[PDB]
Every structure is written in structure tokens, then in C-alpha cells.
Design a protein around this ligand. Sequence first.
Ligand code: YML
Ligand code: MG
Lengths: 277, 279
Amino acid sequence: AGMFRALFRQAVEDDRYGEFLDVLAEASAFRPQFASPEACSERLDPVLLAGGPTDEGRAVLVGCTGTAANGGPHEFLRLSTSFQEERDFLAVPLPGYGTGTALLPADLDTALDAQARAILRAAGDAPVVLLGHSGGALLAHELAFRLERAHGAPPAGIVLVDPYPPGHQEPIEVWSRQLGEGLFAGELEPMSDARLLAMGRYARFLAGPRPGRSSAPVLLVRASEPLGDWQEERGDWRAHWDLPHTVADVPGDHFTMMRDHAPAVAEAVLSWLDAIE
Amino acid sequence: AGMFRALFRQAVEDDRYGEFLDVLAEASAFRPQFASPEACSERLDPVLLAGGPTDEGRAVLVGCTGTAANGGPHEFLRLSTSFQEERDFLAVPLPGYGTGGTALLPADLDTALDAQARAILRAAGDAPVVLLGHSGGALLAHELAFRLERAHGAPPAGIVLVDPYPPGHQEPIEVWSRQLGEGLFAGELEPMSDARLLAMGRYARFLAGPRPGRSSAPVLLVRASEPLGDWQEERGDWRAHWDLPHTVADVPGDHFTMMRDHAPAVAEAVLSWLDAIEG
Ligand SMILES: *P(=O)(O)CC(=O)[C@H](C)[C@@H](O)[C@@H](C)C[C@@H](C)CO
Ligand SMILES: [Mg+2]
């Protein structure tokens, strides 16, 4: 396919996932970019994947697409089936992965602004609960903060499915080989070099210093099975967020929680939305 | 075609050639490699590009292929015609640039130099060897010369360094980086492949690192007479440099055209110098 995919495959084999991700971030510097939300080259209209009952003033769920180069439109499909007849579920695209190939955001705030504008158009008067998994969970919180700070519109809630935020990333660093193998095992087509570069750019965004914390309440959803090997004496390997409103534990590991066990995630979400409403 | 070439083009367009070279070097670490000279995936047999007169003990020229991703077997064709009827000229490939699946990259520079060394000794027989290289290839010519002396008990009779910019003197390289990157696209016969760009990055990194040994062979330093781009006089001298060369020759042209349009002048300097060192 592309040279970057070949290099990534070898990096994962040599257990140097983290090193290759840094290479992807540096290389992404030399891809054409958009520097203002207006200049975004793609249409970020959310897609409706599930319909709630008709019909009021009930929150709609917005799935925040994660950074995985093998991801995209498929990401929330299995999960969304469990929301049909319960809640509207909209998936918003992550800028820079589209289509000529899409312009990359110059910085994270620029991509978040683009997403915020598309979400606010789609949602209308309805309250919004943001949902993301893994790197998308980190992005869901960053979006939530930006909606609040810069768009006068804090979401009604955030659902963070297995987040590993800065300061709490040791297990995900220890398991980077499995993460890399999961990306390859989860391919439907070969990961494009353009999307690999997008993934590196966002990974770098998310390691950088961020402006603060959203006031929206948080549901922390955690996998119950470790993705790889872990010594008990090393501490808790589990996903982490500071002082969540509610915590839910679901079957599966970092990956299988969202497919195999997607109904369990959905059930935790539906219960929580009832509680906060 | 290939993402790396598109990225490279943008980097040059944006005056970030140096930064992009670093990225190529880091990326190249994830290419399949050869760790021993024997494990080299390519036939490094030198090509005879010019023949000396039929009339023992006379030095043969060996063209050390440079690092440019747009190079290869065509590199010494113009220069070599001027050696016809004067000296044998053999051109040795640089490991990591071939095809046939693409070529393995050297794990380290010494590994690539040993592969070349064995090919050269086999091809040259008993004849004394004079190594020749231009730019990146001039740096490689010296490193090979030192490796031949140290690891093969076979110091060359001489080294011809055409426009070298060694680690102590790379301000002109930095100041003209845009022109150097554009020169690389200008000199494309076909689109530089991603595999070759990664090779070029891997070698640039090799040539930045600690290389302690100095060849005992005498050096002819051949210098371009024209600046490749604008240069502020107070920066110092823009010309190519080598520490304590045996002889220095200035030729017409710039860094590129000295070989492109003025190769006969380069051959003439080499031939005069070879006569002087031989007797
Ligand atoms: P020359 O090969 O035209 C340019 C150089 O002398 C520079 C300093 C050298 O480091 C080479 C190895 C960089 C390559 C990218 C140019 O082929
Ligand atoms: Mg000196």
C-alpha cells in the first residue's frame, strides 16, 4: 500500500509503536493544513445512526470519532444499535481524515471549533451528551471544554469510554504493541498514509498542554479485562478520570468492550442519562 | 508518487528541507536492514564506465555513488567520458538504493562501506585505487577510504572530494537548503521513490554522526567557483572545505553545474593531480 503503513507494521512488530507515532506527528507537519474552522476542507455534518422515540428536550448523544487511522464511519455502528428507540445518536467526523485528501487541522482548537459548529447545527435545541472511546474519549472532553469556553454551550454530559489521560497512561504505554496490533487486526481496508499522518498529528495534540476542565458531568466507563500482561504490584491498570459523576464497569478489554460488549456500554449510558435528567 | 515525495516537496516549498531530512532519517529506522556485509541484498559490482589506454601499477578511479535519492547509475556518465583513454573508471553503487521488493538498508555506515569495499577490491585486482565522490558522495568517499585502510588493509592511493561540506562547515548547506532541495527535484529523471528518500535520510544521519578516523590517503579538493545562491559576505567563505588537503583545484560552475556543465574541468584537475602523485 503506502510506505507509512509498511513502516508502522514493522514498528509494531519491533515493539516501537510510540516511536513511530512520534515520526507520524513530525511528518504530518508537511501536509497541507487548515488554520481556521472556516478553512476546513470537509463537510462535518454528523450522521444519524440511531433514532430515539418521537417524542421532550431529551439529550441527544453525539459520538466523537476517535483518532485510529483504521476508523471512521464504522466506529459507532455496533454501539448505536442499542440506542435505536432510546436516543438519537449522531456520529461527528474528525477533521483531516476525509476524501485529493483532507486538510489537516493546524491545531486541536481549530478542529474542535469545526466540529462544534457542525454539532450545534445538527442538534438544534436539544441538549447534547458527547461520547468517545480511547483517544476519542480524550477528544470528547476537549470538545466539551471548547463548546463551554468558546461557544457558550457546555454539553449536558460527557461519556468517556476507557480514557487514558496524561499522567495515567502507563498501562496503555506498556500495552502499545497490542494497540498497534489492534489497529492492524481492525482493518477493513489498508490504513492510508494520509490517515496515519492524521492519527500522529492528533496524538501529538492530545499530549500537549490543554486549557482546562469542562464543568459537564462525566460518566466513566471502564473495561474489566486487561489488554495485556500486568503485575498486580504495579497498581491499577484500568482507565482513569478524576472524580467522575458515575463509574460503570463493563465486560471486555480496551477493544472488546466496544464490539463484543457494546450493549453493556449502551446500557450503562442509558441508565446514566435517566439519572442526570 | 508516494507520500514521502509529496511531503518532501512541501518541506522544500516551505523552506524546511533540513527538518524533513531528520524525519526521513527517523522513519528509515523501520525499513528492513542488513547487519552484515554478506547480508547485503544488492549486487554491488562496479560498472566500468571508461577505459584507460591498453599500455601496470597505474591507479584506477572509483566513483563513489552519492546519497541523492534521484541518483544512481547515471551519476558519473558525463564525468567518465573525460577519463576515456586516460584511466579506468569504475562506479560502485551505494547499498540501499536498488530494486528487484526493494533493497535492504545498512544497519550502520561501516556495514555499507564493508559491502562496497569487498566489491571494489574484487573488481580492481592489484591496481591502486583512487576514490572519487561529489557532495554527499565526497563525504562517503573519505569514510570508505578510512574503512579500506583500517578494516581491509587496503588504503587508497588518493581521494578526490568534489565540493565536500563536512560537519564543521555546513552553513552554506543550511543557507542554500531551499536551492539544494529544488536541485534534487530539478535533477529527477523519474519521481524519487519513498524507499530511496528513506535511504537518503538514513545516509545523511550516518554522515552527521561521530566518524573519528582520518584516512592516510592524500586528498584532492575540487571546489565550485560559483555560489549556488545568495550569500552574505560577512558570514565567511561559502566554498567547499576539507582539512589539510594535498591539493586544491577550483573549477567553473556551482555545486551542481560544476558536474553538470563543467565535468571536463573536474576530470582535467583529477588527471593533472594523478600524474603529480604517481611520478
Ligand atoms: P550534496 O550531496 O549535494 C549535499 C551535502 O553535501 C549534505 C551536507 C550531505 O549531508 C548529504 C548527505 C545530504 C543529502 C540529502 C544530499 O544528497
Ligand atoms: Mg584546515
